[PDB]
Ligand binder design. Structure first.
Ligand SMILES: [Mg+2]
Ligand SMILES: [Zn+2]
Ligand SMILES: [Zn+2]
Ligand SMILES: [Zn+2]
Lengths: 112, 554, 171, 97, 270, 87, 107, 177
RNA sequence: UCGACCAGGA
DNA sequence: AGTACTTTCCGGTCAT
DNA sequence: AAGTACT
């Protein structure tokens, strides 16, 4: 029910201006804020504390502070984070990169 | 990238294991003793002493040598060095924990303060979350200040069971500057205040149990609490703290290269006290100095004021400060960079380009280049551009051959000569219809960056179509815009197939198109409509001629 | 002693060769970078078996250049001596510090003082030898050696062997 | 010019995967370093000529990789190391999922 | 913020919305798996309107001189009147359009019937119209079975999720429900013949199109939805240039922060 | 790893090619083509790689396979051949 | 289920989790005057057999953690009395598609 | 390089590299329990000379064949017969294989894939470990001592009489020249 | 030639 | 309830 | 400047 409100309110902030945003968006956000458990805030205090990798949170509001307690608790980073890769110079699993491409030697013969 | 082939297989990083350096490793890794604090001048004689920077580490003066590693400057990343401290020191950023850990374990024997025996503890030992056990465990035993030797088991509170021993009361602790102090309460009365020497803490940790580590948010292999205390100090190599030479007979050393210089000094001075007139505690007045420097070197924006100002009152750039958000490494070097193949100027509308185009001024199109690969399909056209030169427009300015070597088209005694080789690359000029990424910051839209078709035009401005104005959110009152040029046959694809303005027309941000018709065109499209408005032959004809796709049917 | 280990390799193929008979090329290159190789963990790679059923799997295309990368899984005949391994081979070189036997693709060397005593070293011989009461060791003479210690290096493996134990010497 | 945070976010939204990389690597930083397949570090003393590779300490010469990462990132790492923190670069996942 | 807090969220190939942990955030992007781009405000006619009018429009009774399709519309008009085996499909249909009504009135209590929905049906037909030069004069050639049985055969193919099982195929029905209401609303026997004189040709076309068009409006696994949704909110937040409540920008800030002490607290009790 | 490899049957992803997929196939193919790779369609005179790719991809004569990973890591393999190309 | 009026003594409550398997719950009168589940906003939840759950997981290839969670003390979690591990199925109305099926595990 | 069917999870501290001795302790890459490509388990594969000579020739041969389907589109006597099989299906710069064929073909102890078969069927009743079940096949041995001493991994795994019988049936199968 | 400030542009 | 602590694209000058 | 979270 909270979600329902949290959304309703957020929706009103955008409607009071006479603008329009398709549900899905405000929803998605209102959802991200809720799933975890209750009201997770969109601030260094909340979300940027989740189980997400280090390098990722690392790029927002606490950096070193976060990096320090990373090597100290021997964290392990998946490198599934958009950020993660951006920092490494690798292709992020995003749209164009949400999959791999291969040369099927087989089909490469029926073609001739 | 980097150049020069390596018989080393190449992969992508898949995981990042975070840890803490073990003095022993630090040493193994190092290729430099690092004893002297000086820089070079082997008695003014220019070079580098086997003291600081390059006692075998990286280099300068444009000279191969990197421990024969040669390759020189560009290619030889740095090679860490080390420097054996005198006495254990904290890690400016870990102090917080180092303390919170002691409050979790009692000295002398060094072991937990709450076994499976205490139930409230059990619950805190099932929680699988390093950040959370350790945040609950602590809250539980920060209070108890008596290393219990006998506790009431899962049975009668009458019968007492035994475990580890040494009831030596536990001292509460507080933080004063960079040192830990605590009081031991004596009953019969009054406290007992003494400073917890690093040498001591370090030890108590060394003895903490294997399953004790882990129980508390740690890791037997990558980060044993005992490592939060610095015994051996890694010495970042030039590239981390490069110089800056005004030719020769001058200096140019970097901030860091000084704090080490300091840390080093402050280190030696100490040593020369424990092997000489050691007025016992006239030393711990110079051991705090090491703890300081080796602290400020990493973090220099603490609570205990002393900024460690460097002669001239300039603050001192601590390592931490280099990563701190915005304008720094992480956020301003990795998440966002300066880049090549880019240009920017003033934008002005032009009611004559198709929506998806963008007017690029010859000036730029002759500057920006696109690497094309010599192929039978283009050989001809390509060789022509080359011949053409880098000054005429449709031309090019660089041909690179398999032998990884750049032929600078504007100088090379063979500019006019040259026959291309299938496989060679011919960095040519941007030409009519080279998809490009156009954009106007602040970028807060998919649309703040769109792909247009390059239309080389005269005069100095990016001439964008009107209707694609409201998406970038731009006017011509002196607004500037950025242009980025793709580089790989596949990169373009990524622009042209997902970023092309035509595509952006209808926006998901509000399930409605996001570009329309404005100003004249709009204002005018109304008038031109009205019942009252009629047009006569002579003109109806020109108008017809104007819609390029007119079927030619008056 | 000779083994038949199951190995695999990764070859990076340029789009160029993305022809009709690619498989062919791959295999071919597999062979260029294996047959004749050497490691400490595999020792001498000598010959790729079952040339025909070589598994290529689908190779994946890298992502900056079209080069694809296939994990060619194969099987082959290997051979890596060990310390304490007894083997016989043909002598090749013989000096005043010992003779060097050649156990297959490898060369085991035996020190003058790692042989017996009654076996001296004759210099003014042609070709160079080592004489005994009843034995004579020189070039072609076949020996049976006990590899005392192994030393891996580059693209080869050397080792020192003795002939001071029993049932060790000529044949 | 500068391809800042916002300019990234847009490409991410576009799903313009490779392009992003291209801006961040090839058209800027892009650097090639060598790793220890054992202790995920830059230790490796690569002589890229006599193909020697070593890495005394974790002591190698055999298990070594090569990677491409923004020079700024290399630095990020080296900097972290000087702060006594270890960022291991592993070329294969072992934690599954 | 908004952005950095949703970077990692994208639709994965299973048609679920997750982040870098794999934590499902939405099981179906936007509670429907449709890409915002392919959507328009349509009207669920089945909702508004007097209980009276509803009948006069969707109700067909083959057992009645005044509630049957006048044979001037259907080719097989006269030979149908009275047929009982048809009046069962004809009643099934109606008991459904009715179930629909109540359902919608349970979701959109406001009565508001205009909503963003994939596949613009109004137009898809408008073309069916002048594409076959359909004359509002001569009679159709659709079997009542033709209509009712194809419309049903349509919904079967509007696949969002695919899965080969119950739990999944069950979500399928869910994430389509609303769209269909609108579907059944516009392809109701009476309508299909009295309002838009469709021929078998037209109809079969209208169907094929609705399916394909729908299938396009699905979301592409790959879309970095998070960054999207973020900007989509944060963008019009910049354009905010400024009954006695807390307001816009400052309020939004208040919400995202989840502040305990909000300037305006209010509370409306009915 | 084959437990992470899903059968051609039991397959469940979209039967249609995602815009990113094709976007990348074309690119990737183009790239290779510009690399002097072999072209499986008669160039009706074309000479631009991404153009040839657009052609290869329409006669579905592109020897590529899109491997679609799932959140848990298991993947599904599809062929440009199979994949329907609406857009 | 025990319904107290103004409160229970902190000496008493520490006697509920002392007799497993059996379980006990504490509810205040004033909190039960109105059924929260009847509220316009709160959509209907549902318990899932440790059969229906082991399924939901297998069908999405989800690990327990990646699942949306509900508070052990969440109002409705109590109304039905969940247990650390039980999954609730949340079915609500939607302005994009009539009904939306969601799941909440417990912590 | 050329990875080997077993991803040993190396967690930083690589230090325990035991010795290599006829204590049947061969590198981790040669335990008695290694893994086959299909994913199955399989006994190590120990080859005694002349048994190898046959496995190599066998492949080097069947190579020259599938090397022509595609082409369209007595002691001293075998030295010459093999040199050719190489200068046809080998890299020619595999100076090792050459030298491995000489050695392998000179010190070999069997000529028939039938004789090598019996050798195996015999030794494979010993329960002995592959490496021994190799050396025994490629090393002349008259006494249980010449044996149990040049293959010290035997010592207590087989009664001298028994091992002596085996040595008897070996010289009896040992093809002439 | 790392930087600190100030003025200013959309 | 009080104390403590981090965050808030693109000339000229002076000097380290 | 403010706000929260942390002690
Ligand atoms: Mg402006
Ligand atoms: Zn070097
Ligand atoms: Zn104690
Ligand atoms: Zn190493």
């Amino acid at each position: 029910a909270g979600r329902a409100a949290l959304y309703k309110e957020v929706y009103n902030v955008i409607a009071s201006d006479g603008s329009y945003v398709n549900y899905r968006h405000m929803a998605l956000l209102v959802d991200v804020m809720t799933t975890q458990g209750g009201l997770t805030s969109v601030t260094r205090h909340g979300f940027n504390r989740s189980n997400t990798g280090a390098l990722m949170r690392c790029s927002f509001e606490e950096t070193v502070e976060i990096l320090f307690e990373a090597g100290a608790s021997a964290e392990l980073d998946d490198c599934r984070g958009v950020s993660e890769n951006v920092i490494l110079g690798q292709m992020a699993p995003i749209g164009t990169g949400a999959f791999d491409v291969m040369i099927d030697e087989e089909s490469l013969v029926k073609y001739m | 990238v980097g150049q020069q082939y390596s018989s080393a297989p190449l992969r992508t990083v898949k995981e990042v294991q975070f840890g803490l350096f073990s003095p022993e490793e630090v040493r193994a890794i190092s290729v430099a003793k690092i004893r002297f604090p000086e820089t070079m001048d082997e008695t003014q004689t220019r070079a580098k002493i086997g003291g600081l920077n390059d006692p075998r580490l990286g280099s300068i003066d444009r000279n191969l040598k990197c421990q024969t590693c040669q390759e020189g400057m560009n290619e030889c990343p740095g090679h860490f060095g080390h420097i054996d401290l005198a006495k254990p020191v904290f890690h400016v950023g870990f102090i917080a924990k180092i303390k919170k850990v002691c409050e979790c374990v009692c000295m002398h024997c060094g072991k937990l303060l709450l076994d499976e025996h205490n139930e409230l503890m059990r619950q805190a030992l099932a929680i699988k979350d390093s950040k959370k056990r350790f945040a609950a465990i602590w809250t539980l035993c920060k209070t108890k200040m008596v290393c219990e030797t006998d506790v009431p088991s899962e049975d009668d509170p009458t019968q007492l069971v035994s475990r580890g021993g040494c009831g030596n009361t536990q001292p509460t602790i507080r933080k004063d500057g960079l040192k830990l102090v605590g009081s031991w309460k004596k009953d019969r009365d009054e406290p007992e205040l003494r400073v917890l020497s690093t040498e001591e803490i370090l030890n108590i940790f060394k003895h903490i149990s294997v399953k004790d580590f882990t129980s508390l948010g740690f890791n037997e292999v990558f980060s044993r609490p005992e490592w939060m205390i610095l015994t051996c100090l890694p010495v970042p190599p030039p590239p981390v703290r490069p110089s800056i030479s005004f030719n020769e007979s001058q200096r140019g050393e970097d901030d860091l290269t000084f704090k080490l210089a300091d840390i080093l000094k402050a280190n030696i001075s100490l040593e020369t006290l424990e092997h000489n007139g050691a007025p016992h505690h006239a030393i711990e007045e110079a051991e705090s100095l090491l703890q300081f420097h080796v602290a400020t070197y990493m973090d220099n924006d603490i609570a205990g004021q002393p900024q460690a100002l460097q002669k001239s009152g300039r603050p001192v750039k601590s390592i931490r400060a280099r990563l701190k958000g915005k304008e720094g490494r992480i956020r301003g070097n990795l998440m966002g960079k300066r880049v090549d193949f880019s240009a920017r100027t003033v934008i002005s509308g032009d009611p004559n380009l198709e929506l998806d185009q963008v007017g690029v001024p010859k000036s730029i199109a002759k500057t920006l280049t696109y690497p094309e690969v010599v192929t039978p399909y283009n050989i001809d056209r390509l060789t022509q551009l080359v011949r053409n030169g880098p000054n005429e427009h449709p031309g090019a300015k660089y041909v690179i051959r398999d032998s990884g070597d750049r032929i600078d088209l504007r100088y090379s005694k063979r500019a006019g000569d040259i026959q291309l080789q299938y496989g060679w690359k011919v960095e040519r000029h941007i030409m009519d219809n080279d998809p490009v990424l156009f954009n106007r910051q602040p970028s807060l839209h998919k649309m703040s960056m769109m792909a247009h078709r390059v239309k080389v035009i005269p005069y100095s401005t990016f001439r964008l179509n009107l209707s694609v104005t409201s998406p970038y959110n731009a006017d011509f009152d002196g607004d500037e815009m950025n242009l980025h040029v793709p580089q790989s046959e596949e990169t373009r694809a990524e622009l042209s197939q997902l970023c092309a303005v035509p595509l952006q027309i209808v926006s998901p941000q509000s399930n409605k198109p996001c570009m329309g018709i404005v100003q004249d065109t709009l204002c005018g499209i109304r008038k031109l409509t009205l019942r009252d408005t009629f047009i006569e032959l002579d003109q109806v004809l020109n108008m017809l001629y104007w819609v390029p796709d007119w079927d030619g049917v008056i | 002693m000779f083994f038949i280990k199951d190995l695999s390799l990764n070859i990076t193929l340029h789009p160029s060769f993305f022809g009709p008979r690619m498989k062919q090329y791959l295999k071919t290159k597999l062979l260029e970078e294996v047959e004749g190789s050497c490691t400490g963990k595999f020792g001498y790679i000598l010959c790729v078996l079952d040339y025909d059923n070589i598994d290529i799997q689908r190779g994946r295309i890298l992502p900056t250049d079209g080069s694809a990368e296939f994990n060619v899984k194969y099987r082959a005949v290997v051979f890596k001596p060990f310390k304490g391994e007894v083997v016989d081979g043909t002598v090749v070189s013989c000096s005043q510090h010992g003779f060097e036997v050649q156990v297959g693709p490898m060369k085991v060397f035996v020190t003058k003082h790692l042989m017996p005593q009654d076996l001296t070293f004759n210099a003014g011989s042609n070709p160079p030898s080592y004489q005994s009461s009843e034995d004579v060791i020189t070039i072609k003479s076949r020996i049976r050696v006990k590899i005392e210690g192994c030393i891996s290096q580059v693209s080869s493996i050397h080792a020192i062997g003795s002939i001071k134990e029993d049932y060790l010497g000529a044949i | 010019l500068r391809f800042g945070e916002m300019e990234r976010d847009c490409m991410i939204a576009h799903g313009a995967a490779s392009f992003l990389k291209e801006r961040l690597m090839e058209a800027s930083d892009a650097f090639r370093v060598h790793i220890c397949g054992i202790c995920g570090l830059m230790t490796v003393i690569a002589k890229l000529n006599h193909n020697q590779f070593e890495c005394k300490g974790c002591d190698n010469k055999i298990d070594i990789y090569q990677i491409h990462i923004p020079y700024a990132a290399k630095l990020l790492f080296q900097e972290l190391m000087a702060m006594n923190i270890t960022p291991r670069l592993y070329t294969d996942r072992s934690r599954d999922f | 913020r908004l952005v950095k807090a949703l970077e990692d969220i994208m639709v994965h190939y299973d048609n679920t919305t997750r982040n870098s942990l794999g934590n499902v955030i939405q099981f179906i992007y936007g509670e429907d798996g449709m890409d915002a781009a392919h959507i328009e405000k349509q009207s669920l006619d089945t909702i508004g309107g007097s209980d009276a009018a509803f009948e006069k429009r969707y109700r067909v009774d083959l057992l009645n001189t005044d509630h049957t399709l006048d044979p001037s519309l259907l080719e097989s008009g006269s030979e149908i009147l009275g047929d009982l085996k048809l009046q069962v499909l004809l009643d099934e249909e109606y008991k459904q359009l009715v179930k629909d009504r109540k359902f919608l009135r349970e979701v959109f209590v406001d009565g508001e019937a205009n909503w963003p929905l994939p596949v613009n049906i109004r137009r898809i037909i408008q073309n069916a119209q002048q594409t076959f030069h359909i004359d509002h004069t001569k009679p159709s050639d659709l079997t009542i079975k033709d209509i009712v049985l194809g419309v049903k055969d349509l919904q079967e193919n509007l696949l969002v999720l695919r899965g080969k099982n119950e739990i999944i195929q069950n979500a399928q029905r869910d994430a389509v429900t609303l769209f269909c209401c609108l579907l059944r609303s516009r392809l109701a026997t009476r309508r299909v013949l009295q309002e838009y004189r469709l021929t078998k040709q037209a109809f079969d076309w209208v169907l094929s199109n609705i399916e394909a068009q729908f299938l396009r409006s699905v979301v592409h696994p790959g879309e970095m939805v998070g960054v999207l949704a973020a900007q989509s909110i944060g963008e019009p937040a910049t354009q905010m240039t400024l009954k006695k409540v807390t307001s816009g920008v400052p309020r939004l800030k208040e919400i995202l922060n989840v502040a305990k002490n909000m300037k305006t607290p209010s509370l409306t009790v009915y | 790893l084959k437990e992470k490899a899903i059968p051609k049957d039991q397959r469940a992803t979209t039967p249609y090619m995602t815009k990113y997929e094709r976007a990348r196939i074309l690119g990737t193919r183009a790239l290779q083509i510009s690399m002097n790779a072999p072209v499986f369609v008669d160039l009706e005179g074309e000479t631009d790689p991404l153009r040839i790719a657009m052609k290869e991809l329409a006669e579905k004569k592109i020897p590529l396979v899109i491997r679609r990973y799932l959140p848990d890591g298991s993947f599904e393999d599809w062929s440009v051949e199979e994949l329907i190309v609406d857009l | 289920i025990f319904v107290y009026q103004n409160n229970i003594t902190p000496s008493a409550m520490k006697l509920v989790p002392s007799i497993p398997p059996a379980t006990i719950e504490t509810f205040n009168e004033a909190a039960l005057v109105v059924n929260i589940t009847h509220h316009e906003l709160v959509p209907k939840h549902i318990r899932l057999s440790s059969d229906e759950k082991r399924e939901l997981l297998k069908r999405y290839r989800l690990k327990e953690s990646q699942l949306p969670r509900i508070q052990r003390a969440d109002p409705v979690a109590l109304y039905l009395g969940l247990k650390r591990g039980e999954v609730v199925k949340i079915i609500r109305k939607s302005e994009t598609s009539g009904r939306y099926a969601s799941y909440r595990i417990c912590m | 390089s050329t990875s080997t069917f077993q991803t040993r999870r190396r967690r930083l501290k690589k230090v325990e590299e035991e010795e290599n001795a006829a204590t049947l302790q061969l590198g981790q890459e040669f335990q008695l329990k290694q893994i086959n490509h299909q994913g199955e388990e399989e006994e190590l594969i120990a080859l005694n000379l002349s048994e190898a000579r046959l496995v190599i020739k066998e492949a080097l041969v069947e190579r020259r064949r599938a090397f022509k389907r595609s082409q369209k589109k007595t002691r001293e006597k075998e030295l010459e017969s093999i040199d050719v099989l190489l200068e046809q299906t080998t890299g020619g710069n595999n100076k090792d294989l050459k030298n491995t064929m000489q050695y392998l073909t000179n010190f070999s102890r069997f000529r028939d894939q039938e004789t090598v078969g019996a050798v195996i069927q015999l030794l494979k009743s010993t329960g002995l470990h592959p490496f021994e079940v190799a050396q025994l096949g490629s090393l002349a041995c008259d006494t249980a001592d010449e044996a149990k001493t040049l293959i010290p991994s035997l010592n207590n795994k087989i009664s001298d009489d028994e091992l002596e019988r085996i040595l008897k049936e070996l010289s009896n199968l040992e093809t002439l020249y």
